[PDB]
């Protein structure tokens, strides 16, 4: 082994606590998009940490694109400050990470059909529909996308340890189904 998964995307939610006028928000923000007809939220962005926020009239906000939990909270506080600077009585509350995505490379090809047959109740593999095997782990409850190349995607985690836990649990199985 020796491989440890790399975090790729962190999704979080934040309650600003006050109602927002989206045209005002979009108008005053330096990096905003807002087309009511397409989606009901201002799509705001900041350069550091590089992230994207979906800002709603209710004052709720979704922050995505961060590569670390630190970066997620940091960028979230920053978006909240922007809203304040524009003039609303916003508050940075209820910061919570909802989804963590990770990925790695085991460095060997995998026999997906064998794995799907062996771990049938957790696996779903339809190569004509999507080339990767969808593995639904029980403990921890994580979803893994397994590819012939040996590249692995882990998602559905609320905490970093779950990403790490799942990979540790899957590695022996990937080894059992290697090609070379």
């Amino acid at each position: 082994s020796g491989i440890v998964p790399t975090l790729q995307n962190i999704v979080a939610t934040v309650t600003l606590g006050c109602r927002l006028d989206l045209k005002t928000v979009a108008l005053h923000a330096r990096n905003a998009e807002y087309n009511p007809k397409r989606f009901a939220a201002v799509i705001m962005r900041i350069r550091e940490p590089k992230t994207t926020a979906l800002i709603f009239a209710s004052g709720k906000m979704v922050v995505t694109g961060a590569k670390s939990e630190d970066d997620s909270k940091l960028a979230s506080r920053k978006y909240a400050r922007i809203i304040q600077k524009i003039g609303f009585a916003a508050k940075f509350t209820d910061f919570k990470i909802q989804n963590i995505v990770g990925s790695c490379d085991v460095k060997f090809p995998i026999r997906l059909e064998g794995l799907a047959f062996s771990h049938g109740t957790f696996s779903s593999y339809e190569p004509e529909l999507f080339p990767g095997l969808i593995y639904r782990m029980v403990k921890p409850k994580i979803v893994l996308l397994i590819f012939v190349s040996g590249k692995i995607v882990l998602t559905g985690a609320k905490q970093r340890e779950e990403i790490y836990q799942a990979f540790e649990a899957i590695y022996p199985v990937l080894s059992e189904f290697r090609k070379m």
């Binding site: 090809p109 339809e126 190569p127 004509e128 529909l129 590819f147 012939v148 190349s149």
Partner: protein
């Protein structure tokens, strides 16, 4: 049954049907005398009598697995019949009649299989897949013309009748991602060789070409030469290799058209396989015209 006199654990007993007796094979004691012919008795339920003259014909067979136990005759015209009373007694059956009408969705499956050229064993699996998942809360509110389009591939995937999901996308309807999620929530409750016969037939190739393409495609997978390309592409590519090797050739445009793949994609798989063309062919393949392994396009 077990002989009261002997009692040995494996109770060796014979059914002397011809004398209508059930005997203990060891002591010879007759264990039963009344014995009935099940063949002829079953002839009374499922006969050839559609006219109505047979006095033996006195019942009818039903299917408790598919329609439960719904015994029900139909008011219809007889020899001495006024066309008035038939209408009234039928207009009276209308007030006594929702889910006893959703059985006409079996008529949707039956008319889909017959439009897809599917066997009698596939319909009865598609009708049993649909009866056990159309009232599920796990399917909730899925596209009702895409959950019966998914239960046909569920019935085909047990009856060994090769039908790609894109083959059922042509029938009805199918929204791809919509009948792909529905094909999984029910599942909780093809290969190269599959297409080769049909594609080759449309292609108009000989058995020789079909067999070799079929052998190459399998070897391609066995070799793992095509990492993750769709089987349809692999097959179309293999068909290209074999056919080009033989006299009657078919072009990428023509193969792709039949396989319903694109030449560029067939090109993609083909070139991946070409390097190991030698390993791929059947051993007693006879390249003809002027197409030997060296000469194959290589494209």
């Amino acid at each position: 049954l077990t002989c009261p006199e002997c009692k040995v654990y494996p109770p060796k007993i014979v059914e002397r049907f011809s004398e209508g007796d059930v005997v203990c094979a060891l002591c010879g004691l007759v264990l039963s005398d009344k014995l009935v012919d099940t063949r002829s008795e079953w002839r009374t339920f499922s006969n050839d009598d559609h006219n109505g003259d047979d006095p033996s014909r006195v019942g009818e067979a039903s299917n408790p697995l598919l329609d439960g136990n719904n015994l029900s005759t139909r008011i219809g015209k007889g020899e001495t019949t006024d066309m008035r009373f038939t209408k009234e007694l039928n207009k009276a059956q209308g007030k006594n009649v929702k889910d006893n009408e959703v059985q006409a969705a079996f008529a949707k499956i039956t008319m889909l299989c017959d439009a897809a050229e599917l066997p009698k064993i596939v319909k009865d699996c598609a009708k049993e897949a649909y009866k056990l998942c159309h009232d599920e809360k796990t399917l909730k509110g899925k596209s009702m013309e895409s959950i019966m389009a998914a239960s046909i591939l569920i019935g085909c995937r047990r009856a060994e009748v090769a039908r790609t999901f894109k083959e059922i996308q042509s029938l009805i309807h199918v929204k791809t991602k919509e009948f792909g999620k529905t094909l999984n929530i029910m599942k909780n409750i093809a290969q190269n060789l599959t297409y080769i016969p049909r594609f080759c037939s449309h292609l108009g190739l000989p058995m020789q070409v079909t067999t070799s393409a079929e052998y190459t495609a399998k070897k391609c997978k066995e070799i793992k030469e095509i990492a993750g390309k769709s089987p349809i592409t692999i097959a179309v590519v293999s068909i290209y290799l074999n056919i080009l090797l033989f006299q009657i050739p078919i072009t990428a445009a023509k193969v792709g058209q039949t396989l319903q793949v694109t030449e560029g994609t067939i090109k993609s798989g083909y070139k991946i396989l070409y390097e190991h063309r030698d390993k791929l062919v059947d051993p007693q393949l006879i390249a003809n015209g002027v197409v030997s392994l060296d000469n194959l396009p290589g494209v």
